[PDB]
Amino acid sequence: GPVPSRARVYTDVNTHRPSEYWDYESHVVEWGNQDDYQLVRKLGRGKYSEVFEAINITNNEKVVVKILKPVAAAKIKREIKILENLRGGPNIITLADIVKDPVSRTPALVFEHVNNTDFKQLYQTLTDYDIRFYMYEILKALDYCHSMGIMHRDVKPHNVMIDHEHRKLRLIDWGLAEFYHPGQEYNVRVASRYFKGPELLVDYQMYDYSLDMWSLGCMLASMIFRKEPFFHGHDNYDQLVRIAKVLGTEDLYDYIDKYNIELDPRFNDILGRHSRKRWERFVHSENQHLVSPEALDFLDKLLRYDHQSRLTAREAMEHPYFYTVVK
Ligand SMILES: Nc1ncnc2c1ncn2[C@@H]1O[C@H](COP(=O)(O)OP(=O)(O)O)[C@@H](O)[C@H]1O
Ligand SMILES: N#CCc1n[nH]c2cc(Br)c(Br)cc12
Ligand SMILES: [Mg+2]
């Protein structure tokens, strides 16, 4: 069957922490007072929650309330424990409270409010310097959560809030996050389609923190090349074909061979044969202001089929692409 894999960093962080840290099912939720929060307006509804802008009447501060749906109500302890474990970490959204919503009768997570800049506005206006600055800020959040034994598993632009006015970034939406345990087989139905790593698309379950580094690479490629999204698959199968049209099929087959993976036979008629394209193929007059040899080298080291071969968040922070960023 498939060959096992383990992370090259932070491998045993959960084995050396007390059971209380990662055993989220045994966690006893401390409930706050729902009357402290007055809902103001509905910001949206996802597959798992309804999100509202609210005011904390004990200090007149704005907050965001995520009211979980019954489907979500199952693995809520996992999101709660992860949020409490990471609380206070660099660029991690702060969970302010947990209350029982009187209408849904489900848990409602109360978060710090971010006066975030519109995501299309961010995509259209961030400069070369801004992209480097903000990529460094998201790497601080990812190295922190990885060092804490957690993988986010849903890195994408909408989960990376930026308040451009205060040069403030927060990594949000920890509902798909998981504790990393060496040898554990995880569900591959994580991350949004365009950000899914090759490990998920070929059904390799023994993945790790490096999944987040693929997703970050997808964000970087879209930003510097002005192509939203960078790998535009029509479904999860075509998603792999789009990746293979850029990275080539030979390295894909080497990756499948190394981990002894049985590729779904539905790929036999759609993958074809493709060479790796040099990153300069994607450069044009409308994106040249965001591309540099350092950006291309950094991107090249994130977007690798072999999850064990990708830069870790800490190695990424050492890259020359960030030398220009004021620290
Ligand atoms: N702390 C926050 N500050 C401001 N807006 C937020 C905050 N958290 C979520 N939002 C808003 O709510 C939505 C994202 O919610 P999210 O946690 O990603 O949902 P889900 O877990 O169902 O996928 C977006 O519309 C975003 O603008
Ligand atoms: N793509 C896009 C816009 C956007 N949303 N969130 C982000 C976080 C970062 Br880090 C960067 Br760069 C760009 C964005
Ligand atoms: Mg989200």
Name the residue at shortest CA distance from atom 23 of ligand 1. Answer: 46
> How many whole angstroms from its chain centre is CA 119?
16
Name the residue at shortest CA distance from atom 7 of ligand 2. Answer: 157
Rg from Cα positions in the chain: 20
Ligand with the closest atom to the CA of 83: 1
47 labeled part of a ligand binding site: yes
Ligand 3 centre and the CA of 46: distance in Å?
8
Report the greatest alpha carbon distance in the chain.
62
Collapsed DSSP state (helix, strand, coil) of residue 26: helix
Collapsed DSSP state (helix, strand, coil) of residue 213: helix
48 labeled part of a ligand binding site: yes
Nearest to 109 by CA among 153, 63, 161: 63
Please state, in angstroms and as integers, the Cα–Cα distance from residue 211 to each residue in 83, 177, 199, 229, 244, following that order.
19, 11, 8, 17, 17
Resolution number, Å: 1.3
The answer to whether 147 and 13 have CB atoms below 8 angstroms apart is yes
78 labeled part of a ligand binding site: no
**CB 295 less than 6 A from any atom of ligand 2:** no
Q: Which of 113, 141, 170 delimits the end of a domain? A: 113
Q: In terms of domains, do 10 and 63 share one? A: no
Q: In terms of domains, do 203 and 305 share one? A: yes
50 labeled part of a ligand binding site: yes
In angstroms, the CA 188 to CA 205 distance is: 6
Q: In terms of domains, do 102 and 125 share one? A: no
The method of structure determination was X-ray
The answer to whether 52 and 43 have CB atoms below 8 angstroms apart is yes
Ligand 2 centre and the CA of 149: distance in Å?
24
Collapsed DSSP state (helix, strand, coil) of residue 118: coil
Please state, in angstroms and as integers, the Cα–Cα distance from residue 247 to each residue in 23, 39, 278, following that order.
39, 47, 9
What does the CA dihedral 300, 304, 308, 311 come to, rounded to 10 degrees? Answer: 20
Collapsed DSSP state (helix, strand, coil) of residue 306: coil
Ligand with the closest atom to the CA of 135: 2
In angstroms, the CA 107 to CA 101 distance is: 6
Ligand 1 centre and the CA of 237: distance in Å?
28
**CB 48 less than 6 A from any atom of ligand 1:** yes
46 labeled part of a ligand binding site: yes
**CB 222 less than 6 A from any atom of ligand 2:** yes
Nearest to 221 by CA among 277, 145, 153, 165: 277
In angstroms, the CA 116 to CA 122 distance is: 10
Q: In terms of domains, do 30 and 63 share one? A: yes
In angstroms, the CA 150 to CA 36 distance is: 31
Residues counted in the chain: 327
- Residue type for 182, please? P
The answer to whether 171 and 159 have CB atoms below 8 angstroms apart is yes
Q: In terms of domains, do 89 and 192 share one? A: no
**CB 119 less than 6 A from any atom of ligand 2:** yes
Ligand 2 centre and the CA of 237: distance in Å?
26
88 labeled part of a ligand binding site: no
**CB 111 less than 6 A from any atom of ligand 1:** yes
In angstroms, the CA 43 to CA 171 distance is: 18
The answer to whether 266 and 237 have CB atoms below 8 angstroms apart is yes
DSSP 201: H
Task: Indicate which residues carry an active-site annotation.
Answer: 154
Ligand 3 centre and the CA of 47: distance in Å?
10
Q: In terms of domains, do 221 and 86 share one? A: no
Q: Which of 113, 128, 153 delimits the end of a domain? A: 113
| Structural domain for 195, as ranges | 5-22+114-327
User: Which residues pair with residue 179 across a beta bridge?
Assistant: 150
Q: In terms of domains, do 200 and 317 share one? A: yes
**CB 229 less than 6 A from any atom of ligand 2:** no
What are the residues whose beta carbons fall under 8 Å from the beta carbon of 50, sequence distance 6 or more?
42, 44, 66, 67, 69
Name the residue at shortest CA distance from atom 14 of ligand 2. Answer: 157
Instruction: Answer whether the bond into residue 4 is a cis peptide, omega within 30°.
Output: no
Two structure tokens written together for 250: 């030979």
Q: In terms of domains, do 102 and 124 share one? A: no
Q: Which of 113, 144, 170 delimits the end of a domain? A: 113
Two structure tokens written together for 63: 């907050």
Q: In terms of domains, do 52 and 16 share one? A: no
User: Which residues pair with residue 114 across a beta bridge?
Assistant: none
Long-range pairs of 91-96 with CB within 8 A, sequence gap ≥ 24: 91/137, 91/138, 91/140, 91/141, 91/144, 91/169, 91/170, 91/171, 92/141, 92/144, 92/145, 92/170, 92/171, 93/161, 93/170, 93/171, 93/172, 93/174, 96/56, 96/63
Q: In terms of domains, do 147 and 236 share one? A: yes
Collapsed DSSP state (helix, strand, coil) of residue 44: strand
Name the residue at shortest CA distance from atom 12 of ligand 2. Answer: 131
Two structure tokens written together for 256: 């499948």
Tell me how many domains the chain contains: 2
Q: In terms of domains, do 142 and 246 share one? A: yes
**CB 114 less than 6 A from any atom of ligand 2:** no
Q: In terms of domains, do 215 and 290 share one? A: yes
- Residue type for 320, please? P
Two structure tokens written together for 46: 């996802």
Nearest to 209 by CA among 300, 309, 313, 137: 313
- Residue among 122, 124, 230, 290 to mutate when testing ligand 2 (max atoms within 8 A of CB): 122
Give the ranges where the chain is alpha helix by DSSP (H): 19-22, 76-86, 119-125, 128-147, 198-201, 210-225, 236-247, 249-258, 293-302, 313-317
Nearest to 310 by CA among 247, 257, 264, 224: 247
